[PDB]
Paper text:
Here, inspired by the pseudosymmetry observed in bacterial microcompartments and viral capsids, we developed a hierarchical computational method for designing large pseudosymmetric self-assembling protein nanomaterials. We computationally designed pseudosymmetric heterooligomeric components and used them to create discrete, cage-like protein assemblies with icosahedral symmetry containing 240, 540 and 960 subunits. At 49, 71 and 96 nm diameter, these nanocages are the largest bounded computationally designed protein assemblies generated to date. Here we show that designing pseudosymmetric protein building blocks, in which symmetry is broken at the sequence level while backbone symmetry is maintained, enables the construction of very large pseudosymmetric protein nanocages.
Docking this pentasymmetron against C3-symmetric homotrimers (‘CCC’) and designing novel sequences that create favourable interfaces between the B and C chains yielded models of 240-subunit nanocages with icosahedral symmetry. The original I3-01 nanocage can be thought of as T = 1, with one (A) subunit in the asu, while the pentasymmetron-containing 240-subunit nanocages are T = 4, with four (2×A, 1×B, 1×C) subunits in the asu. The major assembly product was purified by SEC, and images obtained by cryo-electron microscopy (cryo-EM) of vitrified specimens revealed wireframe structures with large hexagonal pores that closely resembled the design model. We determined a single-particle reconstruction of GI4-F7 at 4.4 Å resolution applying icosahedral symmetry and a 3.1 Å resolution structure of the 4 chains of the asu (cryo-EM processing details in Extended Data Fig. 3 and Extended Data Table 2). The cryo-EM structure agrees well with the design model, with a Cα root mean-squared deviation (r.m.s.d.) of 9.3 Å across all 240 subunits and 3.0 Å within the asu. The differences between the cryo-EM structure and design model are mostly accounted for by slight rigid-body deviations allowed by the limited degrees of freedom of the oligomeric building blocks in this symmetric architecture. The main rigid-body deviation is a 5.9° clockwise rotation of the pentasymmetron, accompanied by a 5.8 Å translation away from the origin. The CCC homotrimer compensates by rotating 12.4° and translating 4.0 Å, resulting in only slight local shifts relative to the design model (2.1 Å across the B:C subunits). Within the pentasymmetron, the degrees of freedom of the AAB heterotrimer are no longer restricted by the strict icosahedral symmetry of I3-01, resulting in a slight deviation from perfect two-fold symmetry between neighbouring A chains (1.4 Å Cα r.m.s.d.). As suspected, we observed backbone and sidechain rearrangements within each protomer that explained how the V118Y and P90F disrupting mutations were tolerated in the AAB heterotrimer. Specifically, we saw that the loop containing H91 and the entire preceding helix shifted relative to the design model in all three subunits.
Author numbering:
A (entry chain B): 2 to 203
B (entry chain D), D (entry chain A): 20 to 223
C (entry chain C): 2 to 204
Write the structure that this text describes.
Amino acid sequence: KMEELFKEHKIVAVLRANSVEEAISKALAVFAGGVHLIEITFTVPDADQVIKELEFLKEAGAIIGAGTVTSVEQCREAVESGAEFIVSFHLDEEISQFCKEEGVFYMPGVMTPTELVKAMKLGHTILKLVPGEVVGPQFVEAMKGPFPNVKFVPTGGVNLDNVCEWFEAGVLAVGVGSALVEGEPAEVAELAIRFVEKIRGC
Amino acid sequence: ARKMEELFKEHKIVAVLRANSVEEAKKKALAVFLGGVHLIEITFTVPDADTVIKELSFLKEMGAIIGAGTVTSVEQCREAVESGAEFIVSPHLDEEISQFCKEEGVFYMPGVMTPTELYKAMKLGHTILKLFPGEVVGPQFVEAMKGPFPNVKFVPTGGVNLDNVCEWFEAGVLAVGVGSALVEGTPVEVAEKAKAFVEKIEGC
Amino acid sequence: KMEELFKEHKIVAVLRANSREEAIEIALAVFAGGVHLIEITFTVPDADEVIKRLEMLKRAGAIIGAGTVTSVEQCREAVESGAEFIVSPHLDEEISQFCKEEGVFYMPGVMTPTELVKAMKLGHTILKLFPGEVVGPQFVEAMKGPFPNVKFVPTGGVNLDNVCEWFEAGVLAVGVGSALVEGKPSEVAEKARRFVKKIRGCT
Amino acid sequence: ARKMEELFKEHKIVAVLRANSVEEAKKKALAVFLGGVHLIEITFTVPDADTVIKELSFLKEMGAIIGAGTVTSVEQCREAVESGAEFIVSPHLDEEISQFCKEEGVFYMPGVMTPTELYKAMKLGHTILKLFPGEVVGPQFVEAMKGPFPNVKFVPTGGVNLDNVCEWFEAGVLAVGVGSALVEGTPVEVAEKAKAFVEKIEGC
């Protein structure tokens, strides 16, 4: 029931780190701050162990998935690491079919109307929107018309100053990083709390 | 059908109608026509879209042209064609719809957003394309594709208000599609609002 | 009202780290696990910076206090950082009076009936029982007779194996250090979970 | 042709020129050459582009590099290669041209605008891509794609004037393609304007 969880939480933290240990510390600060959806970038060194070592948070209520997945092999590795969902930056039929059979949630990435339609034909109703800073909220509010049954989760172009604008456009959730993720755990937790407070009044 | 190039060139405006009722769709279509807009399309985002496109023979007799919008499949296209739609418009490029329309002899105008999509639509014989969303790309994508694609005409559908209208036409567009900025509110207001668009596009 | 907060949560995390940075990382792991009442001892380096930094957690529902307060000037310094409550291992009237004037919840430590009486007649109905490992749950039960209106929050001798024995005796809350906080954040968060998990069963 | 990466990195600028005659094309190519621009692209929108490339051989001897731009077909590519074009540039991604160029051993730089087109282009072995229209996506695209695609090098075309040339370099762009902002008017204007571009790029 991922749309029942994305719709409820309304925010996803995208994590990247200089090491495995750093990734764990950041994940804890983010979780403590009230963000339960965590995406681990899979194009970094290690990565595999970050998802596996964060297992202890899953019992607590964290949902950890894998992001920036390019290849099928990466998808396979993310899955046995126990990733609950995969997010890419391009529609990929091989990953889609693999996840469909496996029982893994996949969010394909789109930028244009043609890509959007080709993803629906595969049964995708929740699409990632990239780059968020290029298309903006007025992309989301427009596709609303011709495609009333499609929801977006954008990354980039989103921060505390304009986060509520994306929700007015009609996004299901927003993915955030650096603006949400950086600096010491002491500061990361504080950022995570200011974001959940703005998204809760909008 | 080449006749469509002249029809678009002459009228320079297309009304895109959306509705949650057959009764209002008809009434809005009339007000838009009354205001001086002859190119009208009924989208398939509305109820018995096929019912609306057939109850409008009395406008066809007056020189109006009724087409179908937001056609996303072959089945919707087929239904629109047998309903009397003179042209088919889609948000994206689709080869199956294109082939169907070609066999039928129905004018088809696919949507593009990128230079790659632009080329592949052109390769299928489509020289008139819909630019969508026209707020994300803007009048600067139409003055850049005059180089590599000198024989392509655009009809932008998205963000066209009485303010921009004259910036898009200086960019070399064939016609502009207008949505809620043209069709909204009561029939009386729509008729006058449509008139405003026809007149401002006569100056520029 | 801190007397109500203690009753609702039923556990207090007592955090003594070996550095400012560790104190913060542990506090986050403990909070992430389920513990909302956290007290920071003055044995921690730059303890006053840790209590003023974790201010940001209060808006998330956290409660931050200070422990091992052995003097009135340590008490004063903490109430400035933002300590919501003061805990000291022994009864100290200088702290007692200071806190009363400031309006800060103060919980003095006792071990004997003599200390209990002189503390409770000073206005303290909630006492810290310390060391809990020495007196045991039998102390808490025995006191019910002569002191029916005195509640305890014992520190030390509390583990997952006997946490529900203290609640059977009739404690208000349990103060857990070492067993809860010792180790890296990924282990602290997990241990904190079971402490909150077991107490929900028995209490 | 791995050598091409080095040539682009060292020069950091490409002059993309258009003309209504071979005489204009030749004079414009010379003007930018003296201005300090060694990478020159001759578009196939010019009716005698193959003649221009052939006759500019005398600059090749001087260390100039002459390529072919706006190639939208295999047939145009074939002619460009025979004329001595050192590289082929297209507005979009063509598999047909990519394969032809690979067999010939001619450097090919396809255009992209989206992350999906970007991924598909690199599956064919293309690590250097043209970003087009640069003015539509902007420098933010280059930064966004420097995450998931850390080994991709961009060369934007359009949107490059003396104001931004140094905001495009801050994004980690390999080189910038400059059109009418560099090549416009007669040779003494063009040569000096071209020099101004080279001076600023040395600054950032």
